[PDB]
Design a protein around this nucleic acid. Structure first.
Lengths: 52, 185, 52, 58, 127, 148, 49, 125
RNA sequence: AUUGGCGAGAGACCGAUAGCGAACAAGUACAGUGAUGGAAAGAUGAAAAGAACUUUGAAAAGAGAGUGAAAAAGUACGUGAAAUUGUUGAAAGGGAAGGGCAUUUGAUCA
RNA sequence: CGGACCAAGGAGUCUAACGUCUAUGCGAGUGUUUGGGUGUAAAACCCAUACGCGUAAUGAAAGUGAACGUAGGUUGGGGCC
C-alpha cells in the first residue's frame, strides 16, 4: 500500500510505478526467438579470414 | 605530400551509439543494431537511427497524430511505430482501435488507448512480432514546434521573434518597428 | 502469478507461511538515475564555510 | 601612426575556402514583385482548378 | 613459462627529459611541452632533443610486456595471489613495498607452491 | 564542475584561452549596455529592434487584477468535468439533462471559439463569451449563461 | 558589454549588495523552534485551542 | 552515539577540558580500579586515588611491584609510589611517575569521608 | 535583525609562509613627538632518565664511560631536501660548460 | 625587455538572471522543501489552497480573439503496402 501496486492505490498524490521501456531484461532470448531467427540471414565466420 | 581537396580525418557528423546511459535503451539499441545487421529491411536501420536522436530531436507525439495517421486508407491494419513518448490529446474524442509501439507511454495516453481498445507494446515486443517491420508505419512529431525555434536566425527584415523575457508595451516596440519612430526593421 | 517468498521465523528457520512480493521489486533498475539522485541528495547535509 | 587603408588580399581565398553555393531553386518561386492583378488571376485560377478537380474526383 | 610472443622492440628507449632541465635546477626532469612562440624545441630545429609523439607507441601485442614476457601484477596478500592461478603464464606477481617480511615470506611460499613467478623474490629478506 | 571546467585543460597554456594579440582586459569596450547608439548601434538595430524610444501612453497604478482574462477553447471545454461523469454525459446527449460547466469556478473568464465540440447539449457559465464560441455552443444544442 | 543574440537582462547589483544580503541556513532550526514554541504555548494556555 | 544535546563529542573540546581541568576535576579523573578481593569486599568498581592507598602495578616495565603512594601529582596527571624507582648515575634516587589507571588498589586508607563515599556509591562497609 | 557580550552543539573549512594581526608572556616587542603602524616565534624524549666518573685542554670544549627502544633524539634537541660548502672515491679540461644523432672504452645491472 | 640560485604561496573562483547544446523526471501540464505534520533530529518521509511558466495572440488603448475542407491544393520527400 505504501509504494503502490498494479491494483491497489499508491497512497501518493497521482503516482504510478514507472513503466518498462523494454519488456524483458534479457535480449539473448529475443534474439533466439524463432520469429527473429527466421527473418535474420545466416551469419558469417566471426573474424573474417585475411585475403591478399 | 598530398594536395588534399577536403578536410582529412573529418567526422561523419552522425551520432553513433546513444549518449544517454540508459541500460534498457542500450539493450534496445543493441537489439535493433543486430536486427539491422542481419536483415536488409530499411525499417530496422530507420529505427536504429531514430533511437540515437536527442530529447529535442525526438519531439513528442499526441494521440490525435496517430488517429489522423490511421484515418488514411490502408493504415487501419498498419501498426504505428513512433520513437518517442506518446502523449494524451484531449482534442480528439474518438480513438480507433490500433496497436501502438513506443519507448515511453504517458499515463493518460495509455489509459485512453486501453479504454478505446487499442494495444500498447514496447520496442522489443514490436521487434519480436515483426522482425522486418511488416505492416508498420513511422510517425514523427513537429521538430520546429519548439519555442526556441522561432528565435532561430533572427535578422533585419525577417521577423523571427527577437529574444526578450518580458513582452508588452515599451518592450522591443520602439524605433525600429514603427515607420513614425525613425524606420521599420 | 508472482513468486511467493517464504518468511523465516526469529529462530532462523523458515516457516510454512508464504507471502506475495510487494510489487516494487519489479520496478526498472536505473543505475544512472540512482547515482545522480544520490549525488544530488548527498550535498543537502552540508555546513556552509567561508573565510572572514 | 599611419595604417593600411584597404587591402583585398586573402579575401578571395577566404571566400573560396567554403564553396560559393548557388541560390536554391524551388519548383514554385516566391510571387513577390509580380503584378497584383496577375496575383489575383493566379489565386482565382487555382481556386477554379481545385473546384473542378474536386468535382471530377475528390 | 611465457607464451611465444614477438620480439620486444622499443622505438625510443631513452627517457624523454624537459628542456634546460640540466641547466636549471628548478626545472624537473619530467617532460613538459614548450609553448613558446620562438621556442627552438617547439619549432623542432635540427639537433634538438626528441619530442614525444604518437609514432613512438609500442606494439599492442607487446604493450605492457616485461623483458621476461610476464605482465606485472601487484599482489597484496594470499587472496590477491590467488588471482594469478589460471593466468600464471601471462602474468607475474609483484609485492607491494608496504608488506612486512613475515607476510612476504608466506606470500613467497604460496607463490612457489602455486608456480607463480615473483618479480622481486629478494625483497625485505635477510641476506 | 571544477574538474570538467576548461580551465584545467587551459593550464599550461600561456594565454589560458584568452588570446595573445589581444589580452583579456577587464571591460575592454564600455560597461553593461554602454554605447547603444554610438558603437553598439549595429547590434541594437540588427538583433534587438525597438529598444530605443517611447511606444504609447502611460497608465499609472496598473493593477493586474483588472486585466485577469483567462481563456479556453471548445476543445478544452469538456476537460473541466471529471472524466467519470464526462464519459456518461457524452454518452447521454439529452436536452433535459445536460452537464453544467463553471469556467469561473475553475479560473477561466472568457470563452474563445475553437475546437468544434460534438453535438451534445451542455450548459456553460462564464463572464465573457466570444461570438463564434456562442454560435457553436448554440448549434451544438446547449445554451450559454452569463454569470458574474 | 553588448554581445550576441542574448535577451537584455536588467540586474540591479550596482550597489554594495554583498554587505546587505540574507541567506537562510536556519530554516530547519527555526522550524524546530517554532514547533517547540507551539507545543509550549499549547501546554501553557491549557486545553484551550 | 550521543542522545543528550549538552554533552560534547568534539576531540578538541574534550582535550581542552582534560588539559585545563582544575584540581577538583583532576581528583576524580585520577581514578584507579580495585582488586578482585577488594571488589568482592566492597562492591565498588573503582575509586579515586589517595596518598595512603596501597596499589599494585599491573602494566608497564615495573609489573608485579607494589608499594604505598608517596604523593599524587595532579599537575602531571600521575601518582608516585615508593619502594619502586630508578637510580640515577649521580647516586641519587628520583621517583618514577605513573598513571593511576595502571594500578590495582591492594588496600586503601579508610576515613570518615572515604566511608561516606563508600556508602554513597553503594558499599557494604 | 544581530561581524557586540555570555553559555552551548556542530563542519565534504583551514592547517605554523594556511587559518583572526596574534595557537607561544599578541595588540607584545618595536618604529614614528604626534594621530597611527605592527611583526618573527608550536614538536627532544613515554619517563630529564638533561651525560655520574676517567683523560687532554686555562676555559669554552674534545675523547672514553654511562642513562636511553633509538644520542642517525643532547635543553642549536620529531622526521631532516634543494640552493651553498668540506672530506674520500671516479671522470674530463689548448679562449667556456651544458644538448641531439651512432659507436668504442670504463663502471654498473635482470 | 624580466630572469644569481633554491624552498614555501601564487592567479578564469562564486552568486543573481539568461542564450545554445546534452542528460533525467513528468507531460498540457509542470515545481514537496513559503509553510505544516512526521522524524533515529541542519539527514530522510508525507501534504491542502495559493503562486512562477506554458496551453492565444494582436493593438497606444477602449477592445477583439483562430476549421468554406479529410485542419486545404501542389512540388520534392524516408518509411510502409
Amino acid at each position: 500500500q505504501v509504494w503502490g501496486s498494479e491494483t491497489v492505490a499508491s497512497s501518493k498524490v497521482g503516482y504510478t510505478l514507472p513503466s518498462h521501456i523494454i519488456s524483458t531484461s534479457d535480449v539473448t532470448r529475443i534474439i533466439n526467438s524463432s520469429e527473429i531467427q527466421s527473418a535474420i540471414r545466416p551469419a558469417g565466420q566471426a573474424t573474417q579470414k585475411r585475403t591478399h | 605530400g598530398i594536395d588534399h581537396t577536403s578536410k582529412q580525418h573529418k567526422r561523419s557528423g552522425h551520432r553513433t551509439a546513444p549518449k544517454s546511459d540508459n541500460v534498457y535503451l542500450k539493450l534496445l539499441v543493441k537489439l535493433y543494431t543486430f536486427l539491422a545487421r542481419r536483415t536488409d529491411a530499411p525499417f530496422n536501420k530507420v529505427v536504429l537511427k531514430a533511437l540515437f536522436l536527442s530529447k529535442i530531436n525526438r519531439p513528442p507525439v499526441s494521440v490525435s497524430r496517430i488517429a489522423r495517421a490511421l484515418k488514411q486508407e490502408g493504415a487501419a491494419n498498419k501498426t504505428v511505430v513512433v520513437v518517442g513518448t506518446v502523449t494524451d490529446d484531449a482534442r480528439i474524442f474518438e480513438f480507433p482501435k490500433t496497436t501502438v509501439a513506443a519507448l515511453r507511454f504517458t499515463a493518460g495516453a495509455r489509459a485512453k488507448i486501453v479504454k478505446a481498445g487499442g494495444e500498447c507494446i514496447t520496442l522489443d515486443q514490436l521487434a519480436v512480432r515483426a522482425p522486418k517491420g511488416q505492416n508498420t508505419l513511422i510517425l514523427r512529431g513537429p521538430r520546429n514546434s519548439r519555442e526556441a525555434v522561432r528565435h532561430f536566425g533572427m535578422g533585419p527584415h525577417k521577423g523571427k521573434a527577437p529574444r526578450i523575457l518580458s513582452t508588452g508595451r515599451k518592450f522591443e516596440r520602439a524605433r525600429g518597428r514603427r515607420r513614425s519612430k525613425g524606420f521599420k526593421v | 502469478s508472482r513468486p511467493q517468498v517464504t518468511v523465516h521465523s526469529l529462530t532462523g528457520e523458515a516457516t510454512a507461511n508464504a507471502l506475495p512480493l510487494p510489487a516494487v521489486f519489479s520496478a526498472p533498475i536505473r543505475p544512472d538515475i540512482v547515482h545522480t539522485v544520490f549525488t544530488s541528495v548527498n550535498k543537502n547535509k552540508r555546513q556552509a564555510y567561508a573565510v572572514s | 601612426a599611419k595604417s593600411k587603408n584597404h587591402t583585398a588580399h586573402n579575401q578571395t581565398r577566404k571566400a573560396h575556402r567554403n564553396g560559393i553555393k548557388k541560390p536554391k531553386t524551388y519548383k514554385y518561386p516566391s510571387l513577390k514583385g509580380v503584378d497584383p492583378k496577375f496575383r489575383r488571376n493566379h489565386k482565382h485560377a487555382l481556386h477554379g482548378t481545385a473546384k473542378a478537380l474536386a468535382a471530377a474526383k475528390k | 613459462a611465457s607464451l611465444p610472443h614477438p620480439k620486444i622492440v622499443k622505438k625510443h628507449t631513452k627517457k624523454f627529459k624537459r628542456h634546460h632541465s640540466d641547466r636549471y635546477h628548478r626545472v624537473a626532469e619530467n617532460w613538459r611541452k614548450q609553448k613558446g612562440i620562438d621556442s627552438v624545441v617547439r619549432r623542432r630545429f635540427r639537433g634538438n632533443i626528441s619530442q614525444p609523439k604518437i609514432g613512438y607507441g609500442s606494439n599492442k601485442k607487446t604493450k605492457f610486456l616485461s623483458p621476461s614476457g610476464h605482465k606485472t601484477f601487484l599482489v597484496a596478500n594470499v587472496k590477491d595471489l590467488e588471482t594469478l592461478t589460471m593466468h600464471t603464464k601471462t602474468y607475474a606477481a609483484e609485492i607491494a613495498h608496504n608488506i612486512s617480511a613475515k607476510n612476504r615470506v608466506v606470500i613467497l611460499a604460496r607463490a612457489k607452491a602455486l608456480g607463480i613467478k615473483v618479480t622481486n623474490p629478494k625483497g625485505r629478506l635477510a641476506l | 564542475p571544477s574538474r570538467f571546467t576548461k580551465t584545467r585543460k587551459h593550464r599550461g597554456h600561456v594565454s589560458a584561452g584568452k588570446g595573445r594579440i589581444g589580452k583579456h582586459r577587464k571591460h575592454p569596450g564600455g560597461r553593461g549596455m554602454a554605447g547603444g547608439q554610438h558603437h553598439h548601434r549595429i547590434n541594437m538595430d540588427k538583433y534587438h529592434p525597438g529598444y530605443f524610444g517611447k511606444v504609447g501612453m502611460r497608465y499609472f497604478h496598473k493593477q493586474q487584477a483588472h486585466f485577469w482574462k483567462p481563456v479556453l477553447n471548445l476543445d478544452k471545454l469538456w476537460t473541466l468535468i471529471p472524466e467519470d461523469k464526462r464519459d456518461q454525459y457524452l454518452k447521454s446527449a439529452s436536452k433535459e439533462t445536460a452537464p453544467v460547466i463553471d469556467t469561473l469556478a475553475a479560473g477561466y473568464g472568457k470563452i474563445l471559439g475553437k475546437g468544434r465540440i460534438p453535438n451534445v447539449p451542455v450548459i456553460v457559465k462564464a463572464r465573457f463569451v466570444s461570438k463564434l464560441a456562442e454560435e457553436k455552443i448554440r448549434a451544438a444544442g446547449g445554451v450559454v449563461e452569463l454569470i458574474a | 558589454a553588448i554581445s550576441k543574440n542574448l535577451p537584455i537582462l536588467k540586474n540591479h547589483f550596482r550597489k554594495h549588495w554583498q554587505e546587505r544580503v540574507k541567506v537562510h541556513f536556519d530554516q530547519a532550526g527555526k522550524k524546530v523552534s517554532r514547533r517547540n514554541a507551539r507545543a509550549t504555548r499549547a501546554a501553557k494556555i491549557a486545553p484551550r485551542p | 552515539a550521543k542522545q543528550s544535546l549538552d554533552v560534547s563529542s568534539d576531540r578538541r573540546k574534550a582535550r581542552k577540558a582534560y588539559f585545563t581541568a582544575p584540581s577538583s576535576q583532576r581528583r576524580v579523573l585520577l581514578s584507579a580500579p580495585l582488586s578482585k578481593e577488594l571488589r568482592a569486599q566492597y562492591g565498588i568498581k573503582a575509586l579515586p586515588i589517595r596518598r595512603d592507598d596501597e596499589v599494585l602495578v599491573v602494566r608497564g616495565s615495573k609489573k608485579g611491584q607494589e608499594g604505598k603512594i608517596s604523593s599524587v601529582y595532579r599537575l602531571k596527571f600521575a601518582v608516585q609510589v615508593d619502594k619502586v624507582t630508578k637510580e640515577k648515575v649521580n647516586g641519587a634516587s628520583v621517583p618514577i611517575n605513573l598513571h593511576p589507571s595502571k594500578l590495582v588498589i591492594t588496600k586503601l586508607h579508610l576515613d570518615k569521608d572515604r566511608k561516606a563515599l563508600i556508602q554513597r556509591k553503594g558499599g557494604k562497609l
